[PDB]
Paper text:
Viral entry depends on the SARS-CoV-2 spike glycoprotein, a class I fusion protein that comprised two subunits, S1 and S2. S1 mediates ACE2 binding through the receptor-binding domain (RBD), whereas the S2 subunit mediates fusion. Recently, we isolated a neutralizing antibody, named CV30, which binds the RBD, neutralizes a pseudovirus with an IC50 of 0.03 μg/ml and competes binding with ACE2.
Twenty residues from the heavy chain and 10 residues from the light chain interact with the RBD, forming 13 and 2 hydrogen bonds, respectively. The CV30 heavy chain is minimally mutated with only a two-residue change from the germline and both of these residues (Val27-Ile28) are located in the CDRH1 and form nonpolar interactions with the RBD. Val27 forms a weak nonpolar interaction with the RBD Asn487 and sits in a pocket formed by CDRH1 and CDRH3. The Ile28 sidechain forms nonpolar interactions with the RBD Gly476-Ser447, particularly the Cγ atom, which the glCV30 Thr28 would be incapable of making. The structure of the RBD was used to align the two complexes and showed that CV30 binding did not induce any conformational changes in the RBD from the ACE2-bound complex. The structure reveals that the CV30 epitope overlaps almost completely with the ACE2 epitope. Binding of CV30 to cells expressing the SARS-CoV-2 S protein decreased overtime indicating shedding of the S1 subunit as a mechanism of neutralization that complements the steric prevention of S binding to ACE2.
Author numbering:
A (entry chain E): 326 to 532
B (entry chain L): 1 to 27, 27A, 28 to 211
C (entry chain H): 1 to 82, 82A, 82B, 82C, 83 to 100, 100A, 100B, 101 to 214
Amino acid sequence: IVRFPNITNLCPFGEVFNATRFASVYAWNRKRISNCVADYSVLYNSASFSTFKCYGVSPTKLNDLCFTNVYADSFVIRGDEVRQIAPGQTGKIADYNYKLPDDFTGCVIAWNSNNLDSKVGGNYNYLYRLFRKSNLKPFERDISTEIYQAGSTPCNGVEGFNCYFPLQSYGFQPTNGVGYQPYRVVVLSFELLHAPATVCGPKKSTN
Amino acid sequence: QIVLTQSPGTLSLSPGERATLSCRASQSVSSSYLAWYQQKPGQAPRLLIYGASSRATGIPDRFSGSGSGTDFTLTISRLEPEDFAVYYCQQYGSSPQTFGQGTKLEIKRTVAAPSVFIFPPSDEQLKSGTASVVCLLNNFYPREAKVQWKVDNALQSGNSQESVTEQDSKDSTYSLSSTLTLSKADYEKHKVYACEVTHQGLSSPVTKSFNR
Amino acid sequence: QVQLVESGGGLIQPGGSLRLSCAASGVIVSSNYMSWVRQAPGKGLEWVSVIYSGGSTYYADSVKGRFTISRDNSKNTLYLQMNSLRAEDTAVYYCARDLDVSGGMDVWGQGTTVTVSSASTKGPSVFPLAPSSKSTSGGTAALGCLVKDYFPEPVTVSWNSGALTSGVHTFPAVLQSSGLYSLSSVVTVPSSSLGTQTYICNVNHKPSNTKVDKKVEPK
Ligand SMILES: *[C@@H]1O[C@H](CO)[C@@H](O)[C@H](O)[C@H]1NC(C)=O
């Protein structure tokens, strides 16, 4: 009545969600998940997330599905910047840092991490791209540190008027407003690729 | 959205003193997203400080900014004659970006009481069908001055419009006019038309009146 | 050079359309955050719209659906298409570039004025402000003209064909309930020379081609 592959490994979700350090949004981390089993309902309740939004699929119905590969993206942004991590959204983050496709099928998980990513003197280790000539294609990662040319005069790699470094630091202090505090974000992408499915839910096979 | 309340409304100082301008936000704002702008009458805003403390290129050292959370400060250590203008703060960390209502930096001088003149409606305009009574306050400081219209000892509120000049280049005073507009029918209803003026330079309120 | 030059501002009635232009030099508009900021007469600054280097556009809630921001990279100019204009949209509009945390809004245009009103261009009525009785403070007396019920802005007022400029105050215009502007221009003179010297106003109104010279004298 039910038949899934004989997969025994557990998916390294704890390696992603409970990592001691996350990445800057402009250089986001992508973990490729394959050949493992994952329960998405225990993940929904494993912690108290601020946003757990799914698109297309549902977390409850997600346990009944198999996928070729599942992709996990993790980074840190501001509190009121999480709304840009969604299909069809625009903004400094969606345009120049991390972009979702309009036909996005998956879930985006975010939770406050002020106690982890805020330092007293200010945590300037989390960066974000402020200047970019054009938008990002979906799932594109631009880690270039080229001096941004805002004027007609070339920059020759030196900062000045109309020549600005394209990356800026978040001022992450624990006394910030709720919208200014760091939020760790995890994006889950489900890929069906006409191939053996290797990432399934926790359903047990019969005969 | 976020509301920036600047204080004081007007700041009265002499050249050479230190100016301290306050910008209080209705929400906590990160210091990296606060700016200060200067605007003179008829001109465009001129960026002074961004990031609460970083001076724009070309801004002298006497301008300095500080603050965090909800309280921010623009300080001019030693005021120059060209520093008297209107100053706005601005937050740009939360959409939509908002400005304060502005603080006016005004040259301070000795208290000067105003000369009060009153004018009945001209006989030409009385033909037109409406009556305009004008009360003039000439060359005074400070700008704070109350102007109350009294028609047969009745306090008249709702039909007067005041107009004030900018601070003069020479004597640094203000002049104010208050126009009471009525119909010819209502203007003929009453008799005594008075203009009472309360000011810092007046020991008691002065009243210029005429009879129709 | 680094200049932002604006144009397209003028006079229009409720519902009409207007397109503002903002020509840039020394700064490429398609490579910067470009914003519009407006200032109603005698009021503060209000953000209107912004366009990103990548094309994303955002508008204030009061002008959303009626305004449209765009740019032409060949001309290096910025545009603000305004439709369904309202009386509250009357303001001086500025274009500026934004550096955000990297330097704020550091380049501003000179501003272009937009006026939204349904009134008809009309010349002013001028009436004398006779120096009634002594009009004495310590010995001086005051008099002037009343420039009432005109549209649109502005008017120019001089005294004795520009010969008198001492002790003259020409107040700023006031917008009345009728929608027409009203103005007064006073002067202070010695009461001894009231009967001696004659005083005449000099009111000029270019938009309606009206030139009135009223003579004020005691009554
Ligand atoms: C993360 O750690 C907490 C506490 O150790 C645990 O309850 C939670 O299940 C973990 N999450 C994952 C995805 O392993």
